[PDB]
Design a protein around this ligand. Structure first.
Ligand SMILES: [Zn+2]
Ligand SMILES: [Zn+2]
Lengths: 407, 433
């Protein structure tokens, strides 16, 4: 059974997150102080990245921004790059170009797409090719406690297999694959599909991870196997306290799958839309829920309206401040000034409640929209409290900074 | 006497401690409501150019306001008054043969311009005394209805201190009880005032001076009544924070406190009273002044703020006019600028294709110092806004980042995250690089 961390000496914000280990919304408690150790599964570098990747990394970029810029947690984040893999091998033979040269090509394009979307880079980037030796040492320790013996793993009282999805032996999975290459004590081989993530996360972050994230497709078999693998290495029972899984994205009602050729590259999207509009799209959909994207701008129409209204809001308010004259004005605190201020401080508490509610950005975005509507009337008709307008502009800048929006 | 700490239930608790002048000690800070802080700060007297003493107080509280909001996420509602009608202004307006409003408007504009030059944020509300005179008269009417003030025949009103003390719920001069011997004051012998320590709420006006209509006759507000009136109307019966320089603790703030307790008839108008330390120039009180504008022809806004960051807001300070105190400030400003120049160039020219990103011991050592510095600085801010020790922490971290960037292979993501933390702290300090 999952054991929530103790609250003593830790930052307690009363934040709740959908934890796939509990299949429920639970309060988030750091393992140490205000520190959040966070490992996120990274992409497979054989292709251009598409909207499914963008949704996961932008959604967790938004979550990371909420945790750090808004709640003041101290976040240490690591993302791996899987540049050695069966799929990478096969694509290099179809294209008759080198496997490492191809992987380096699409990792560069991935990082260029992330910067185009204003996604912050993690603290550490762990490439599988640079960590193969540590992976081999990792397997050695599992044996001291190649294929994972699932039957032996369950037998232990301190270990439980498949904490997140209910469903020698067929259920055994490979840790090390025999070469059809790199040297190892057990023979030439390649890493298995899942062991790479468990190895790299353990070396940098250690025996306990505050958060582990990824898309929902990866929950089984990949993430459930990562949990079992890491518990076997350290010989303990909970390698990850909170597991966050983003929902799937369907384009025109079907899963993005290789055979369909239904993918939309991030670069193609960016020839028609801004980073702000693409982020607004993901802010409008809850990170933990599924989404349908209708291409050709059906889904982006609402996003573009919102982006346009934020841009105009800033044009007006900066002009009003610019033309404000302290000599010619009267600064009595009117009933209109006071009513706007109450809505301003109310909106602050609403957004706080929304972020605590599992990073409910769709409702926080609507809250900002309502506040902007009220400021617009105030600026048009009422006599303006220059200090109140400036203070409001800074709060909205702070929230847009938490969203990664740039105005 | 007695102080009531706010209840902690349902409130934002950051474990911040502040030097509260009501207790003359450091007490935990608890908001009156949620995470909201209603804050009133006494403003300047607009008859002259502002000088370095005003700058120390308003910059020091600008730093605290940024710490409270940008770092701790309190929600701060701040009000500053402008005393644009006052005895000093009247005398200066007669000396210069210009109108009282024309003079006050000139030096209010120059005050806010000097504040803008130093990167001091404007408050939510700015309350000019001339715009609030009618509210002031209503405020006095209530003090009289509660029998804590009395009307002289000439047309003045005075606070009845003796009646105020008699109440069990009231104590006079809660913060400087001992500053309370004039003895044979001509006004007391005449029996106009009742006791010499009584002070005027409303002043019957002398000829050839501005005046306003009132129930007691044409007159002006007294020196202290203005701040109590204005703060109550916007913030209400309880103020989370009331700030000002230490010179104003008595009589100005103690009388402001007595007036507001009398109006509402309760015992604590202000939960936390913060008093900035004195600015001395060459070891003596500024009585030798330096205008803020003069300082800014010789030093940057960043350098002037580093000076106040180097001195704790609640402690006394010595300024050496021969540039002795600003020498260190200029060195620090120089090293922050260069650090940002270096770190920005290293980030720009980093190539993700050509690099290796194995997590080294060098990468890990910088990361550990990175997270250590975050916890140290957090503790310094909790310790009564100890900016001097937090600034030294940033300096030590910067020395190590400079070494890392030169020799070791750089983990770009760690360097970016470090730059963003330092950008975040410099925003909290009001520095701009
Ligand atoms: Zn993975
Ligand atoms: Zn005052």
């Amino acid at each position: 059974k999952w054991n929530q961390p103790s609250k003593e000496g830790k930052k307690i914000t009363n934040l709740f997150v959908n934890n796939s280990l509990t299949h429920s919304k639970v309060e988030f408690i750091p393992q140490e102080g205000n520190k959040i150790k966070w490992y996120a599964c990274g992409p497979t570098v054989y292709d251009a990245a598409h909207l499914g990747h963008a949704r996961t990394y932008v959604s967790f970029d938004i979550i990371r921004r909420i945790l750090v810029n808004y709640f003041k947690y101290d976040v240490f984040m690591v993302i791996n790059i899987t540049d050695i893999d069966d799929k990478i091998i096969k694509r290099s033979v179809e294209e008759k170009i080198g496997f490492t040269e191809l992987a380096r090509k699409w990792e560069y394009e991935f990082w260029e797409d992330m910067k185009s979307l204003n996604v912050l880079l993690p603290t550490a980037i762990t490439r599988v090719s640079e960590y193969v030796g540590d992976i081999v040492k990792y397997i050695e320790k599992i044996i001291e406690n190649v294929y994972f013996d699932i039957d032996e793993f369950k037998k232990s009282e301190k270990h439980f297999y498949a904490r997140m999805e209910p469903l020698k032996n067929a259920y055994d999975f490979a840790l090390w694959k025999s070469s059809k290459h790199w040297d190892s004590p057990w023979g030439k081989g390649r890493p298995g599909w899942h062991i790479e993530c468990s190895t790299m996360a353990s070396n940098i972050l250690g025996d306990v991870l505050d958060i582990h994230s990824g898309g929902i497709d990866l929950r089984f078999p990949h993430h459930d196997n990562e949990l079992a693998q890491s518990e076997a290495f350290f010989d303990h029972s909970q390698w990850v306290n909170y597991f966050l899984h983003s929902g799937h994205l369907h384009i025109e009602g079907l899963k993005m799958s290789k055979s369909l050729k239904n993918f939309i590259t991030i670069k193609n999207m960016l020839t028609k839309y801004t980073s702000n509009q693409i982020r607004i799209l993901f802010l409008l959909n809850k990170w933990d829920n599924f989404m349908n994207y209708s291409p050709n701008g059906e889904s982006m129409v609402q996003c573009i309206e919102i982006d346009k209204s934020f841009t105009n809001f800033f044009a007006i308010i900066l002009m009003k401040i610019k033309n404000f004259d302290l000599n010619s004005c009267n600064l009595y605190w009117s009933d209109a000034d006071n009513k706007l201020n109450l809505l301003f401080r109310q909106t602050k508490n609403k957004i706080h409640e929304h972020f605590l509610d599992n990073f409910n950005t769709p409702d926080a975005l609507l809250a900002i929209q309502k506040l902007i509507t009220e400021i617009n009337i105030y600026m048009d008709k009422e006599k303006i409290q220059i200090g109140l307008l400036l203070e409001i502009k800074h709060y909205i800048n702070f929230i847009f900074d938490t969203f990664g929006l740039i105005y």
